[PDB]
Design a protein around this ligand. Sequence first.
Ligand SMILES: CCCCCCCCCCCCCCCCCC(=O)OC[C@H](COP(=O)([O-])OCC(O)COP(=O)([O-])OC[C@@H](COC(=O)CCCCCCCCCCCCCCCCC)OC(=O)CCCCCCCCCCCCCCCCC)OC(=O)CCCCCCCCCCCCCCCCC
Ligand SMILES: CCCCCCCCCCCCCCCCC[C@@H](O)O[C@H](CO[C@H](O)CCCCCCCCCCCCCCC)COP(=O)(O)OCC[N+](C)(C)C
Ligand SMILES: CCCCCCCCCCCCCCCCC[C@@H](O)O[C@H](CO[C@H](O)CCCCCCCCCCCCCCC)COP(=O)(O)OCC[N+](C)(C)C
Ligand SMILES: CCCCCCCC/C=C\CCCCCCCC(=O)O[C@H](COC(=O)CCCCCCC/C=C/CCCCCCCC)COP(=O)(O)OCCN
Lengths: 64, 53, 459, 56, 104, 54, 121, 175, 329
Amino acid sequence: IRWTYARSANIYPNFRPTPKTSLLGALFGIGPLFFWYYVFKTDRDKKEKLIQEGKLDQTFNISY
Amino acid sequence: GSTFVAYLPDYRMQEWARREAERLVKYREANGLPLMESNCFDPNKIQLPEDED
Amino acid sequence: MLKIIIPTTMLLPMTWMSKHNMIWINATVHSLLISLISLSLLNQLGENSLNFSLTFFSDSLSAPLLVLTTWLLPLMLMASQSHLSKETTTRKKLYITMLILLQLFLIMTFTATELILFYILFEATLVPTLIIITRWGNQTERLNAGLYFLFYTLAGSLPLLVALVYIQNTTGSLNFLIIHYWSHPLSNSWSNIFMWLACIMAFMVKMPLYGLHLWLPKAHVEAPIAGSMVLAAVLLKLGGYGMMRITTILNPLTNYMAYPFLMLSMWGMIMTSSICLRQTDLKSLIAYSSVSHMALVIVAIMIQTPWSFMGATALMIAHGLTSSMLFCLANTNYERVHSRTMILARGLQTLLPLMATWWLVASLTNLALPPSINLIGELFIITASFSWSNITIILMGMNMMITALYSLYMLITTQRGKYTHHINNIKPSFTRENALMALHILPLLLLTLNPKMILGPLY
Amino acid sequence: NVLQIVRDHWVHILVPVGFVFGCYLDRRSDEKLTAFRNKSLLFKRELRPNEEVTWK
Amino acid sequence: HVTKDMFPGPYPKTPEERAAAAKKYNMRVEDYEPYPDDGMGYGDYPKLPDRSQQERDPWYDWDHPDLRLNWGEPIHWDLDMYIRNRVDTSPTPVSWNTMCKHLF
Amino acid sequence: SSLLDLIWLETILPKTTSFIQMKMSIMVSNQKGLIKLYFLSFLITIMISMTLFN
Amino acid sequence: TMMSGRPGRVPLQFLPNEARSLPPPKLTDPRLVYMGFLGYCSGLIDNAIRRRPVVSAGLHRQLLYVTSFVFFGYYLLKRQDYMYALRDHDMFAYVKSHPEDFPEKDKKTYGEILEEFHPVR
Amino acid sequence: PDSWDKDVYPEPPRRTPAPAPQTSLPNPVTYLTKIFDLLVDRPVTLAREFIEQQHAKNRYYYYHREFRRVPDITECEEKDILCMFEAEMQWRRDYKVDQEIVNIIQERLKACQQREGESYRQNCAKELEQFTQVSKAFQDRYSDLGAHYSARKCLAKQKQRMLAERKAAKEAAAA
Amino acid sequence: MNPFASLTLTTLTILTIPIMMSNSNIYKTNLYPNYVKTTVSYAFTLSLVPLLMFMHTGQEMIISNWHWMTLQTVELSLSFKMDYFSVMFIPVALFVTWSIMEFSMWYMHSDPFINRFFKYLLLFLITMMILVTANNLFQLFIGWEGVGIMSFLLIGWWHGRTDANTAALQAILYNRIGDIGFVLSMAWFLTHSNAWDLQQIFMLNNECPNMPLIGLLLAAAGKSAQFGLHPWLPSAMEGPTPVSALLHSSTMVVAGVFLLIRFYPLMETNKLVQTMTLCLGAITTLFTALCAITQNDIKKIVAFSTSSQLGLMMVTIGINQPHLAFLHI
Ligand SMILES: CCCCCCCCCCCCCCCCCC(=O)OC[C@H](COP(=O)([O-])OCC(O)COP(=O)([O-])OC[C@@H](COC(=O)CCCCCCCCCCCCCCCCC)OC(=O)CCCCCCCCCCCCCCCCC)OC(=O)CCCCCCCCCCCCCCCCC
Ligand SMILES: CCCCCCCCCCCCCCCCC[C@@H](O)O[C@H](CO[C@H](O)CCCCCCCCCCCCCCC)COP(=O)(O)OCC[N+](C)(C)C
Ligand SMILES: CCCCCCCCCCCCCCCCC[C@@H](O)O[C@H](CO[C@H](O)CCCCCCCCCCCCCCC)COP(=O)(O)OCC[N+](C)(C)C
Ligand SMILES: CCCCCCCC/C=C\CCCCCCCC(=O)O[C@H](COC(=O)CCCCCCC/C=C/CCCCCCCC)COP(=O)(O)OCCN
């Protein structure tokens, strides 16, 4: 019971905002989102430019 | 209920569409027409705006 | 549509005038009959809709949700029969009344042809669920859980109402048919951006979207078994249905307004799945798996392609059935052990073999083993996402692997290994529990034979 | 025994009666919208010799 | 049946509450050692050695033979990470660095 | 599980809302019940409404 | 809208004479049935609060509850219908008398309207 | 079989070689097919004849539903809801028919690839060309419309394509 | 008429009757293992006939019998490819399965759940036949995942042993890593070729790009235990010896090589993927033989031998000799 309670419900009352926790939270919770946004946005911009210039060869691409 | 659902009549009209497509393909191959056409609506009834740029 | 609504209303006087020892029998029989009647809505057309009247209409998106809603009620009654044995007759009748009122509100919400009517019933579904959670919940956290489940929801839905009335002062109508036929593009403007956010956030918060999902584990672990069943199977899909309906007036803003949510989903499905790897509560694990599946549904709806919509519909139905079955299995363990901790009761395959078979089938379905409709929805969504961007496969692929892991983890911890020595009160499974699992699992494998029924209006 | 089991099983008629009443209610709604019956450009048809309405 | 005072609490700052925490977790005060009082909410919970469950004695009569646990003994914060079905930390015939160098 | 779900996502939306609403409630309701201060405030609002909305 | 100052309005008339040109609500009006249902619920709650058998304590009292609710609901429905009729009458009269504020829009056909296309990709 | 139109689903004349045994050893395949015929094909045929005569005792018909042509979206007023409803239904029916046309051509292509064997790359040129044309037309008509597709969006896409074509033609002529 | 198709479908169909009877009275008696063994021997004898027909003439067939569904322009139907590979592999698999079942009748005599064990073996055989005879990518995926689930269930046969459960989860993990590439290939082919059917994929891909072939190579490496994803095959020796002889020795682990063989028309038009396959196979066979050279458990030695042989098969695929790889299988 002590193990399950400590793992679940004793976390937040013992939480303290510190430079380490603040920095780790910012990194682990924000960095991946912007990394993936940059990756996907660059990919879709490249694809859109290729489509507008007409050089993509989407023959037989019927289902989307 | 499963038997009822299995034997539901074709109100989605799949076989009707198949028959219609068969007749269209037959007619167009018989008269040399190029199967499906690129324009969904014939341009005779569209009034484009003159740019005059 | 009244041929389904009126008998559901007649369930209430039938419940209240019933004998003290015959409430469950009558409720179960007549709920099953109502489900059989509602089965007739599945006959849909490739054309517009089944527009019964000015108030109600049915679609091939609404019909499977209605059938699932009507089918869930008898299962909830069977699941609730056990732990409500020592309860007074009046309070048992009140419990059944709450379940019936929830079913009525859901039925009407799915078939409503007006956005405002839809909003009113979509909010009316809150009161029975809140009462069920905070009255017949077991632990002391239920009160807090209820508060979360309420305010999150309301915090999302009060702006929507504003937007809705605003729309009706501009277009002149909130009827969905007129709205679809008279749609106009949304120009890129700050006012349009905030209208988009108001129309989207209420449905995002109930999916739930990653980062707005904190209410769901609380509510699902604190609710009674019927509450967990209805919350996981039907109430989550209200947001998906609403977003599917409302995205017709949000174009072409969705082309770029969808980016923050898509990321929040595509990364989010990873996080929640990984959360399932380190969980000490069964219900908490099942709830987080629900969050991952609904993140996939959010991606499907935001992509806005035919394959995306088909996959989202199929996945919604499949997840409803699977999560309800998993919650029922966890509860059948809890009623014997009274702990809700995964590693307490162990090696249960030796003591309960048929229940172990039910566990295996449920885990396989949650794992999306082909040709289950879970995998059909997942694969259609993945193909649409790949067309959206070829890089997405990476994240999608990762999720697949992780899902299998935690699914089998839950199967191995509870069913395999050695039995716990001091637990000597594990009785043979009752016919009621076995019938509950069978009635959960047979419709899924039957539906895999006719997937067109659950593929939505874009099939 | 009739007039005794009724006092316990009269409850079992409520849902089926509700179903019949709901069907009857649905029929009433249909009558109101007959504004375009046999008037659509797609299904415009000449009546049969002993036909009053195309649908009900 | 567990009382309110038998649950995990906040980080112990004084030797008296330190000794009180040690007794609550059924261990000697000399062996009790909580996690560092950082931001994360470990709190009162004791920091046990990071050894896996696989390197526990297999010839002892554990109450839970499969998990190699005894009833009442303090459970490692990461027990579900080390359950003999998962990552283990058992000593190897060859050192970790040598294995990494050879494989790479 | 711990840093994001149990701490920071909890910190951002719900806990901040609770803290702010509770602090505002304490601010608003903590009044001694003396008509002195109430009527002085009434005078201040009367002057503000006279010299701000016209 | 604010029809309080509407000319030719009697100060305390519930239903004017001109309201008699409108069809009366049917006795089987769904809103009348809902009003009767409200009266029945009031009777049941009255039974429950007074600690009496809820369904079958006072039949005369429940009948009076339902009848009073139906009576008031009928008259309320008449007044509501009359008020909406007045609103529509004034709207149409105003549109007729101000033709320069409500011009007839020159009807156009979708074949001669250029609407921008946004691909979904 | 008369159950389908031979022109819609064409097939080559199916020329097959004649048995030319070179040795005196009896091949087991022929004997196996004779015993298969005797033990399987005859009883199945007899059961089929019984079922067919039972079906002939009760003969009744069903019909293909014919649809009238209605004005399309290109001749509907801006807010005339009835005309847009009829045109939308007609456009959706046409969309389904086009999908089935593409399906027919794809079936032709797959059958050709299986039938031609090792020389499918050269002997299935016509089917590949037909599929290329039909796929191009279908992609021009219906691609990128979205999940909330409609006849108005298809008309807008066609109008933009015609504007681009007209601009390109004027630019090339005025080169 | 043309007994080829009837015979080919009858083999797979009569493989399923004991599964239906697993709820009858025969399943509760001690004659069930002999029932399953006799059924498999009869299926082998029946399947010997289409092989004779192909040997005489070269008979090849596609049977698209049941229409499952239609997503607009994509038609999904239950289709079987009865080509050289199918009609040559089915008799061999049935022969080996008959031998293994006769062996298990003696080996697992004291096992209380021997009926269940026999039933599990038949389920694996059915899934492997589905994998081998599939004509579209969805049916092939069905067989692909079925054999993996049966492998998980049969590796962890003794579920009270922690190591067996660990090995079963390990096999699932590695095969899921391969499933990522399988799903990649399916998505690419649907998006570009508008088909999961093999005929259209061959028609529309005259110069196959890198992405679908790399996905197929990832799936093959996952399921045939190539060097990156190899250890699960030696870990799979936790199961009973008949399981190790049937699934993880000769029949199930050659599924990745079979997948690469099925897509050989697209593979010969790509030189980079061929080189990748060659290098992967070479490193796999060398590393696994080197590991086998010092092992002391006999089953481990034979498992590493199987892995090295699979690497040799992939080497054969890499030098553009798919029929040689099939013969080696
Ligand atoms: C879209 C909606 C559609 C449906 C509409 C829903 C509303 C309709 C009704 C509205 C209210 C009117 C009736 C309620 C009066 C209250 C009396 C009562 O408590 O029940 C006792 C009574 C049975 O007990 P008893 O043996 O007579 O005496 C016990 C004492 O009364 C006292 O017993 P006790 O003291 O021993 O027990 C104490 C118990 C007693 O506490 C209570 O039961 C009080 C009742 C709740 C307050 C009522 C609120 C006022 C209305 C607001 C409704 C909200 C709807 C909005 C949606 C949100 C959902 C919450 O309190 C507790 O245990 C505390 C725990 C609290 C649990 C959680 C509280 C949740 C309350 C929310 C209830 C909302 C639905 C209620 C449905 C009807 C309930 C009877 O119930 C009945 O039998 C009467 C019910 C109706 C009679 C129907 C008969 C007509 C059938 C004829 C033929 C069929 C017609 C069709 C014609 C065509 C055929 C040919
Ligand atoms: C246990 C040991 C074994 C014993 C059993 C042995 C026998 C094995 C047989 C079991 C499965 C084997 C597969 C055989 C399939 C044959 C039947 C199949 O062909 O029928 C399907 C039909 O299946 C049904 O359509 C699907 C079942 C309906 C599911 C609805 C669920 C019922 C209500 C429950 C509540 C709903 C909850 C979920 C809400 C969404 C598809 O038919 P279809 O080719 O297409 O057309 C039918 C004929 N037509 C052309 C005249 C129309
Ligand atoms: C917390 C858990 C998750 C909850 C759900 C999160 C999802 C909600 C995210 C909101 C979506 C984005 C909102 C606005 C997107 C529009 C694009 C714009 O922001 O980008 C640039 C805009 O530049 C800057 O962004 C200007 C605004 C900067 C100030 C906004 C605050 C930035 C961060 C705030 C985040 C706080 C969110 C939580 C609130 C409690 C584009 O430059 P520009 O071409 O010029 O503007 C184009 C728009 N026009 C056409 C109308 C003019
Ligand atoms: C789970 C918690 C989520 C909380 C809800 C988050 C969504 C918030 C959406 C914005 C709230 C207000 C929506 C407005 C309703 C739509 C009506 C509309 O769009 O009309 C606009 C009005 O738009 C506005 O005025 C909106 C201004 C914003 C004021 C309220 C601020 C609320 C907080 C804003 C930031 C947070 C939004 C995202 C939150 C993300 C989730 C936390 C045009 O007005 P006009 O003047 O008539 O036309 C212009 C030409 N003359």
